[PDB]
Amino acid sequence: FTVTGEGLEYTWGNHPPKRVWAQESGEGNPHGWPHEVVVYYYNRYPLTTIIGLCTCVAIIMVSCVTSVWLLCRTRNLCITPYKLAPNAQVPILLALLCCIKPTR
Amino acid sequence: YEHTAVMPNKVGIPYKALVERPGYAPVHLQIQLVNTRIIPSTNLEYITCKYKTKVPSPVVKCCGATQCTSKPHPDYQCQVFSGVYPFMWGGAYCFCDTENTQMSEAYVERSEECSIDHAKAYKVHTGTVQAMVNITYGSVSWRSADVYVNGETPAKIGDAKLIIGPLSSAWSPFDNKVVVYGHEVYNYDFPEYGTGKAGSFGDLQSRTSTSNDLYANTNLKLQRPQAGIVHTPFTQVPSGFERWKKDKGAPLNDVAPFGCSIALEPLRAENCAVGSIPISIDIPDAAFTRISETPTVSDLECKITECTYAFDFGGIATVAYKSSKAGNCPIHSPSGVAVIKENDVTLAESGSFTFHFSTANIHPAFKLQVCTSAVTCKGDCKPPKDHIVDYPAQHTESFTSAISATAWSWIKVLVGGTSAFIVLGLIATAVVALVLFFHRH
Amino acid sequence: YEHTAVMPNKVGIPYKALVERPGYAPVHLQIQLVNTRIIPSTNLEYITCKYKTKVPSPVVKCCGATQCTSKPHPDYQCQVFSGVYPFMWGGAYCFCDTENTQMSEAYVERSEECSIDHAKAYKVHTGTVQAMVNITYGSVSWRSADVYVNGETPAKIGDAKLIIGPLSSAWSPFDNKVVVYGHEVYNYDFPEYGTGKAGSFGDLQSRTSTSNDLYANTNLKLQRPQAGIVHTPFTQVPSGFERWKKDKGAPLNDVAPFGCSIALEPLRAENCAVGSIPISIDIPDAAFTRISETPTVSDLECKITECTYAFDFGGIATVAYKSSKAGNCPIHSPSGVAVIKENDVTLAESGSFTFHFSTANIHPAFKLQVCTSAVTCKGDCKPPKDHIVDYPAQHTESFTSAISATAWSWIKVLVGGTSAFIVLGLIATAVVALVLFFHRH
Ligand SMILES: *[C@@H]1O[C@H](CO)[C@@H](O)[C@H](O)[C@H]1NC(C)=O
Ligand SMILES: *[C@@H]1O[C@H](CO)[C@@H](O)[C@H](O)[C@H]1NC(C)=O
């Protein structure tokens, strides 16, 4: 019988009813390494950790993709003025940061 | 002095609060429910039981036929059968071969067990809710009284006045129609009186156990006697009450949610945890002491020696303590992080006392008051063991209870990294749009 | 057959219909509702009356001092007055100079007038609604029966099933707090048990008429017996019943809207003319008659002979009928424009009979069915010249009643003039839009 924190009352035959409560004592280490962290919370709250993990991978994915898109956009908007004008000097700071090939 | 609060509708566990009148020593009260009963207003629609199909001795007339007549009896049946020719002991009985007729009437009535066992059909309404409350405050010992849980009716518990109610939730375990049998109730949709359905629950419907009127639909056909013997053979649908007893549902005593037993004499729904109750208690002014007579505590620090977030009081902490004078002082933690088992603590001059508590947090950062002075206790709890436990939880869990100060650190670094990449991209757009849109001309 | 309808919850107005089950003569149905008994479920909370202060004999202990306990009594005082020299006839009653005791016990309890008068306070709930109804159908005479107003109750009125569906509106004159006094009720909130305000209403609060507990709260104070005369001088607020009688509000029955009168012993509001009632009357089939038996009526011509839109039936008209054979007809208008005084007309051949009717429209257009036939007749009515009268409104007014058929003409010609002028504009724009733009081209 799956006994939750709210408790379970079971009656067996003519015996008086017995109430049992399941204290939140799972496996896993709440501290320490990430794998033990995730297993402790999965045993504590299975559905919550699954949706939480899915949300967190989702939010890091969208943020990382949007960031790289923003960055590569800026990279283009940095090089293209110099790209188009091959005969100018490409400032060293721009050269190393919006990292650039030296054009002819 | 009037103090208001909200207390969870959970019977066993006491509810501790510290009513505080500025200028007086804060007096510590305790409110413990011991009964909370949902009493619905009910009326008896009818009662049902096994029937008895009594057969009057049939009348048999020789060389001639009687007729049937109707009498005001539950499920009365008459059927004159022709050419009976009965054969009693000591010879045949009725002279005339053919032209012999037997009346053979039956009728239905309450069995001799109705008075002992009988289902009772009830229609219930919203009704009232009342409870038995146990109060302590200051030096006054525990005093109990019965109160009506509604926002208006007060109760003079000892010398304090107490107003409890309403329940935050109007839930009751009972549907519109219920049936009580023995000592258990069932949420059955019983047939409205006078529409019994010949053998499922309503086949005998007597308004009261001793009511002369009676409704009965046992489908009492009356078969002819055969082979020249004297008897009244009938076929009849078996007792609806018996069928109901065999195919009885799970009783509401075993199926009701929130865990309340059903008691019977007023038809209570006893001790189930639904929502919370407001509390409005007027403490007598004579129970408040002046501050000057009570110790004032300063230069406090608390150090949680041990703590495991178990259901019982699995936390021991100590408090470094300096006072104004010796005496007895109450203690309390307002927040829901931890519940303190001790109520008052004796305090020397410049001692250090200990208290016990129960918490649900991995990291129980809670505030504790000792005679109008707060201390913050941080600690770091450790998992309990032994799984199933017989006693209820003494604390209330919150959503931010299981986060263990590395998981916090992880969601911190994750959101920080995510925001940092996003904001870096934003600043990148700013600088490119600055050097390029402007600052090339 | 079953006939369903709806009806004004009015008290003297008869409700007239014709049941029409095809192939039979129409049959005339009359329902009259003679009281409207809205019965609210109530619980007595507490009763109250004038207090009376019994001052038991004082204890005069001479030299020395007694002390007195708080014996449990409503609003009990007991105060020892030290330094008394009670000076009776034939000697002073004590041999000490000073250091004498005068105990001054006071105690308050219900007066004996509480037996005969008491403002008992209830708590109103939704309750049930029922009514006494009077039916008339066919040639059967009047048949009266009380009826629960709820769809779920057969209420067999004679030989027909009458189901009166739950009252359209659920309005009740009574709020949740009502206090009954004598022959009247008050829609007054009452400070309930133990919340007695100490002097306006709840000075005394007794749970029932003969209850041993009494929540007196009357602010009894005791004073020093002056100048050594034995007596227990007590000063306190006058009775709450006094001020409640003097500043008593208007009784509910004098304020209850919708002409709602109140009766007492069930605490019921009668004749309460709010909203409407559904009706479902299942008439016997035997009261009908085959259409082929029924007379033919033809070449009907009805003429209004004088009408005046009075409350009472202030219109007389004549119908010229030609007939097949002697027999009865019902005459009612299927529409609210008229109400016909005459239930049935039992009619010979080839003749011209007169019927009375009541209406408020100033050109009635009743379509009145004599013996499953039809005839429509109209004409002018004039103002009946009385101002205020005491007969309630027999007819129901609709908005399209007062327009005098010149004002109808006036608004018609006005609305036509606006619409036609705009249409003339629209035609002009189109014809210039094409003749002048596209044809020149
Ligand atoms: C109130 O609590 C005290 C102590 O827990 C107990 O002795 C007493 O029986 C309780 N009251 C009732 C009515 O059970
Ligand atoms: C029914 O209506 C008739 C109409 O005259 C009246 O005489 C009779 O009293 C009414 N029934 C009752 C019960 O009052």
Numbering used by the authors:
A (entry chain E): 316 to 419
B (entry chain D), C (entry chain A): 1 to 441
Paper text:
Alphavirus spike proteins comprise trimers of heterodimers of glycoproteins E2 and E1 that mediate binding to cellular receptors and fusion of virus and host cell membranes during entry. We recently identified very-low density lipoprotein receptor (VLDLR) and apolipoprotein E receptor 2 (ApoER2) as cellular receptors for EEEV and a distantly related alphavirus, Semliki Forest virus (SFV). Here, we use single-particle cryo-electron microscopy (cryo-EM) to determine structures of the EEEV and SFV spike glycoproteins bound to the VLDLR ligand-binding domain and found that EEEV and SFV interact with the same cellular receptor through divergent binding modes.
To determine the structure of VLDLRLBD-Fc-bound to EEEV VLPs, we used the block-based approach, which involves subparticle extraction, and focused our analysis on the quasi-threefold (q3) spikes. The global resolution of q3 spikes focused on this receptor-bound cleft was 3.5 Å. For model building and interpretation, based on our mapping studies of EEEV–VLDLR LA repeat interactions, we used the VLDLR LA1 sequence. However the cryo-EM density we observed likely reflected a mixture of different LA repeats. The cryo-EM structure revealed that VLDLR LA repeats bind clefts formed by adjacent E2–E1 protomers on EEEV. In the structure of the complex, two basic residues in EEEV E2, K156 and R157, make the most prominent contacts with VLDLR. Both are found in the central arch of the E2 β-ribbon connector, an E2 subregion that folds from two polypeptide segments that interrupt the connections between E2 domains A and B, and B and C. The aliphatic portion of the EEEV E2 K156 side chain makes hydrophobic contacts with LA1 W50, and the E2 K156 side chain ε-amino group interacts with the side chains of LA1 D53 and D57. E2 R157 interacts with the side chain of LA1 D55 and, nearby, the H155 side chain interacts with the LA1 D57 side chain. The adjacent spike protein protomer (E2’–E1’) seems to make minimal contacts with the face of the LA repeat that contains the short β-hairpin and is less conserved, and these interactions only involve backbone atoms on the receptor.
